[PDB]
Amino acid sequence: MEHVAFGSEDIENTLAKMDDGQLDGLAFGAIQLDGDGNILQFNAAEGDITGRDPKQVIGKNFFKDVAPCTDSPEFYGKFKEGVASGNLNTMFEYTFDYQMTPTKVKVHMKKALSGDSYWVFVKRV
Ligand SMILES: *C(=O)/C=C/c1ccc(O)cc1
Numbered sequence: 001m002e003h004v005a006f007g008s009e010d011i012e013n014t015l016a017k018m019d020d021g022q023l024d025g026l027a028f029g030a031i032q033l034d035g036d037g038n039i040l041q042f043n044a045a046e047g048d049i050t051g052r053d054p055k056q057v058i059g060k061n062f063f064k065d066v067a068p069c070t071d072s073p074e075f076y077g078k079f080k081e082g083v084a085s086g087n088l089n090t091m092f093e094y095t096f097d098y099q100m101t102p103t104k105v106k107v108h109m110k111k112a113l114s115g116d117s118y119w120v121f122v123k124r125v
Pocket residue numbers: 046047050052066067068069070095096097098
């Protein structure tokens with residue numbers, strides 16, 4: 001395992017050193033998005049939570065394509081506000097229910113240290 005906790009204060013610094021293989025070592029789901037919501041990275045823990053195969057969703061748009069249940073003010077709305085403002089750090093619970101058994105998670109969205117990409121971190125609750 002990679003030794004970093006969900007919701008860590010400096011998580012964007014710690015994850016700046018991870019290629020796909022190291023992200024796969026996290027204890028929680030990690031998705032990196034560009035400012036439009038396109039998936040840049042998607043780790044193994046996330047695939048275990050939601051069933052998606054990482055290489056099949058990278059390059060897709062998370063809000064339009066992969067996760068329409070997140071296309072709402074309560075999720076995408078927060079994301080887009082953060083992309084627009086150029087800062088994002090929000091944690092909230094949510095239920096993922098598209099083509100899957102509804103699964104309650106805790107989500108932490110945080111702007112990456114890199115200028116315009118955004119993490120979506122997920123763990124079960
Ligand atoms: C709602 O449509 C949620 C979908 C979803 C969330 C997270 C994933 O890893 C994959 C799909």
